[PDB]
Design an enzyme around this catalytic site. Structure first.
Site, short mmCIF file in Angstrom:
data_model
loop_
_atom_site.label_atom_id
_atom_site.label_comp_id
_atom_site.label_asym_id
_atom_site.label_seq_id
_atom_site.Cartn_x
_atom_site.Cartn_y
_atom_site.Cartn_z
N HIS A 20 14.05 -11.53 -1.57
CA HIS A 20 14.84 -12.43 -0.74
C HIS A 20 16.22 -12.50 -1.39
CE1 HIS A 20 16.26 -16.31 0.87
NE2 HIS A 20 15.37 -16.15 1.84
N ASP A 64 8.86 -15.38 -7.72
CA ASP A 64 9.37 -16.16 -6.61
C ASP A 64 8.23 -16.35 -5.60
OD1 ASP A 64 12.07 -15.62 -4.16
OD2 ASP A 64 10.40 -17.05 -4.22
N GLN A 120 6.59 -18.23 -0.83
CA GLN A 120 5.74 -17.94 0.33
C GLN A 120 4.30 -17.63 -0.05
OE1 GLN A 120 7.64 -18.22 4.11
NE2 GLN A 120 8.69 -16.81 2.73
N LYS A 162 8.53 -25.72 2.65
CA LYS A 162 7.75 -24.65 3.25
C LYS A 162 6.27 -24.95 3.03
CE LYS A 162 10.96 -20.76 2.88
NZ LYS A 162 11.11 -19.68 1.93
N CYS A 188 17.24 -13.05 5.63
CA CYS A 188 17.80 -13.07 4.28
C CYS A 188 17.22 -11.98 3.39
CB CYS A 188 17.58 -14.46 3.66
SG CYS A 188 18.69 -15.74 4.32
C1 LIG Z 1 12.34 -19.17 1.58
C2 LIG Z 1 12.45 -18.31 0.31
C3 LIG Z 1 13.47 -18.52 -0.61
C4 LIG Z 1 14.53 -19.59 -0.40
O1 LIG Z 1 14.03 -20.90 -0.69
P1 LIG Z 1 14.87 -22.21 -0.29
O2 LIG Z 1 13.97 -23.37 -0.41
O3 LIG Z 1 15.59 -21.95 0.98
O4 LIG Z 1 15.97 -22.30 -1.47
C5 LIG Z 1 13.55 -17.73 -1.72
N1 LIG Z 1 12.65 -16.73 -1.93
C6 LIG Z 1 11.65 -16.51 -1.03
C7 LIG Z 1 10.65 -15.39 -1.28
C8 LIG Z 1 11.54 -17.30 0.09
O5 LIG Z 1 10.53 -17.09 0.99
#
Ligand SMILES: *Cc1c(COP(=O)(O)O)cnc(C)c1O
Ligand SMILES: *Cc1c(COP(=O)(O)O)cnc(C)c1O
Lengths: 404, 404
Positions: B121, B198, B201, B224, B362
């Site tokens: 991302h 990260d 998700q 999320k 993104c």
């Molecule tokens: C949604 C997402 C982000 C961004 O997170 P925010 O809460 O908008 O700062 C970063 N990395 C991944 C893999 C995401 O799915």
């Protein structure tokens, strides 16, 4: 202005801290919120939440519209030239940290000097100390006066050719002093220096016109303006903003991202807002802005002034009470009881159901000047009453007779 | 697991986007929140709000207790060794930006190389590009496979003696791919490199054990995870945290502030949380953590898996439909209809009352690999139903017959 009406909008005010009716005299640290605000956000989450990135579907498209609207509303609150001059931040602390990093790291080269006051909040000291640390610049402090005012006469000895920026507080969070921004703003400009005004404790007491002040930077927090936590406004002159580079990357502050051709950035203010925003908080801040503006900052000013000039009068009947700051203070009263530590005094007042702040109030430097380890801080907001003021003075008299 | 029961907790689900019942198939961008969460925060603001800085009065003292509790709860959610290993951030984006700045600026000297995937991302690309930009390090990318998986065979050619950190996604926000973290984690360690996962998700689809994974950094966003906006968790190994310097200054991340002797910093995690926290958001995140954990991530996993393996089956009846990613995807389905742009396809689905995400999500780099300017993204959460899946496929068939 009617307190009875107002107070009826804040549910926490009808609470009982210690078996006794609560007396929240600590709004300077964080104001309580009215229903209108609390629900405004709750409804958003309940009937129309979605991602605010100009998505396809209506829900997201509409959330984005809502978000941008608050930005405009706020732009009018402080009279910014254009809404694009306002950046959404978590609060005053992040706001300053953003400017220091982005604008500071590219305008203050080693050798130059920065000016800050001695009554500044830690959020307007540390970030600057860090800049000077890496850049190699010199930090100059504007001395203080016994009455809690600035030693303006020492200005010509501080301002020079190497002065880049002037970080000063609009109002003091401990002394309630309101610095002469207007005049100081021009002086710093005459030398080609910028001015960052930390008005985290001014926006809620009376009107503010960033256009009349001509400051280049202005920050404030929402949670102190009867708004939700986690949201704040950072205002920077369009001219300056457009030139500032990004601080936080990723999210949606980019225009293009290439692992080969590199990435580019969007235009301000969006350039300084990477990742998903605090949509909920934004919605809340809007309602707060609306609520307060409805009552009229000038009315809130009149009432708050009266209650203060009354609290100071009664506060005289208390013996051994030592006050700090001018007689023309703003929504804040810093005092100390004889030789008893604020810890104990404040701890006793709590037993009486009064909420007062004790400690150094994130202004250690200011304390050292008064050779005091910490003081007591009683704040007077728009929903506070004379009876509470009385409830305070009486308790002070009581703790005096008991402790000595 | 009963959808009917669950869906009954989310009021927005009973909404009507365009005269038609709403079908929120865009939770990958931001999940909807259940009542329990929405009210948990609203009540806090209504009957017990105050500053969370270990103040004197009960209200503030109790708010602080609440705040710290959520931190512990979250620590258990991802199985962190100790709650002091968790830092409160606005979200995944700020989380990474914090690590990059604090830990990166002092561990990745010019010459060294950093590894990231091609499916990452933008929040896990830009911040790293910026570091390499100032530090002078080299950024290496792990190639991708047609099925949307990583070209692991190219690992030995990337990992070397100058490899400092490995930033990789737990799950893809576009392909729904779940990278083999465990194994990759050890490989990067064998060379003495750190790994930042990260998992923005991943946390909401199934259980996560930062202890079993042995990652050195792990981030995720609350909005999320059926939680409030403006709040996120940054997990970093105690050992590493204690050594990391501050990024943001001021507020309460200091232990002492002297205009002469300088200032010192507190210990982690508090050292990385300057200024007033997002108390409201923290409270909310707690309720979300509780709500989800109540249903059981393993149950939510089973249901979500079934609905997916069903959506993929029906999605076959649709002609000219091109899917991206593996058959073993997670809560996300990236597709495209023939030669029609996702803009139009997604715009049509909205008219049918379906909420789908269109664009580059993104992940511009990932798109370029598939030589596509943008795709469609249908997400399947715990409150989604088969009927919605059907409502989606049918609409796709319709837009096909109409547009061609
Ligand atoms: C949604 C997402 C982000 C961004 O997170 P925010 O809460 O908008 O700062 C970063 N990395 C991944 C893999 C995401 O799915
Ligand atoms: C309260 C205050 C701050 C800190 O603001 P936060 O919202 O906690 O980041 C900074 N400066 C002044 C003058 C303040 O009163």
């Amino acid at each position: 202005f009617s307190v009875d009406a107002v107070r009826a909008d804040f549910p926490v005010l009808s609470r009982e801290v210690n078996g006794l009716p609560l007396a929240y005299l600590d709004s300077a640290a964080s104001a309580q919120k009215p229903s209108q605000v609390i629900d405004a956000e709750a409804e958003f989450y309940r009937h129309g939440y979605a991602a605010v990135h100009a998505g396809a579907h209506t829900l997201s498209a509409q959330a984005t519209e809502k978000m941008e609207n608050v930005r405009k509303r706020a732009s009018l609150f402080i009279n910014a030239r254009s809404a694009e001059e306002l950046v959404f931040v978590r609060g005053t602390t992040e706001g300053i940290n953003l400017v220091a990093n982005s604008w500071g790291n590219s305008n203050v080269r080693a050798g130059d000097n920065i000016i800050i006051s001695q009554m500044e909040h830690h959020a307007n000291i540390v970030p600057w100390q860090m800049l000077c640390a890496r850049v190699g610049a010199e930090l100059r402090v504007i001395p203080l006066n016994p009455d809690g005012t600035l030693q303006l006469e020492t200005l010509p000895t501080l301002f020079d050719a190497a002065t880049r920026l002037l970080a000063i507080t609009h109002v003091s969070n401990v002394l309630g002093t309101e610095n002469p921004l207007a005049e100081m703003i021009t002086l710093a400009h005459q030398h080609g220096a910028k001015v960052l005004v930390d008005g985290a404790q001014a926006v809620m007491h009376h009107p503010v016109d960033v256009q009349a002040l001509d400051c280049d930077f202005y920050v404030f927090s929402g949670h102190k303006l009867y708004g939700p936590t986690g949201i704040g406004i950072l205002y920077v002159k369009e001219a300056l903003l457009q030139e500032m580079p990004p601080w936080e990357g990723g999210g949606s502050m980019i225009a293009t991202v290439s692992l080969s051709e590199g990435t580019t950035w969007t235009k301000a203010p969006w350039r300084f807002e990477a990742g998903t925003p605090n949509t909920g908080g934004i919605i809340g801040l809007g309602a707060a802005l609306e609520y307060v503006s409805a009552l009229g900052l000038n009315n809130i000013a009149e009432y708050e002034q009266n209650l203060m000039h009354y609290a100071l009068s009664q506060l005289e009947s208390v013996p051994d009470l030592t006050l700090y700051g001018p007689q023309a203070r703003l929504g804040v009263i810093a005092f100390n009881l004889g030789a008893h530590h604020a810890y104990d005094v404040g701890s006793f007042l709590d037993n009486y159901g009064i909420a007062v702040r004790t400690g150094h109030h994130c202004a250690m430097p200011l304390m050292a000047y008064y050779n005091v380890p910490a003081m007591c801080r009683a704040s007077l907001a728009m929903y506070n009453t004379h009876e509470e003021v009385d409830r305070l003075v009486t308790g002070l008299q009581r703790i005096h007779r008991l402790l000595g």
